[PDB]
């Protein structure tokens, strides 16, 4: 659990920790935003301090949709603005949860994380002789919300299996404009 064997996933409301965030200046006053700044023990802007670091891994998990979008971009900004190099230092990535559960008849079931790769899996089980309900056999998952607890985790969280994408300083950038675009209203 020391820092090099930590992660920590904010999640939209190896040791892993795990803290929500539901969805400039009152952003930073709301307790979760404070419970993440804190937990990552790094101190903000001019107190930044990298040795400080709690977490080698800081991994942002939220719904495809706007929602989601939003908590995300409002992370990746605060991050860009007040602990950079968190960034640019490859600590931030965003995991990508599955799309699809192919609900194989008499096997464990499999994940997809793309279209392609659903039709890929569905392609290669039905080869090898495995049985699917045609009609509600791949479930598409509408949010996060709609996942069983277990299954989240072997998903998004098991190291072994999880798709995470590292942020760049440029997505940052991104997120930054984006958080200005639609805060100009």
Known sequence: TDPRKSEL????????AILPLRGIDRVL???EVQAIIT??????????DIGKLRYHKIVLMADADVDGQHISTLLLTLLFRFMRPLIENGHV??????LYKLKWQRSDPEFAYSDRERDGLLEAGLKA??????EDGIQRYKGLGEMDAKELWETTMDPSVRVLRQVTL????????????????
């Open 170 to 185: 440029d997505d940052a950038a991104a997120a930054d404009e984006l958080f200005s675009i639609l805060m100009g209203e």
């Open 93 to 98: 990535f965003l995991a990508q949860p599955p």
């Open 29 to 31: 006053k709301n307790t």
């Open 9 to 16: 996933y904010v999640v939209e409301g190896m040791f892993q």
């Open 129 to 134: 002789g495995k049985k699917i309900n045609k």
């Open 39 to 48: 937990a990552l023990g790094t101190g903000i802007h001019d107190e930044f």
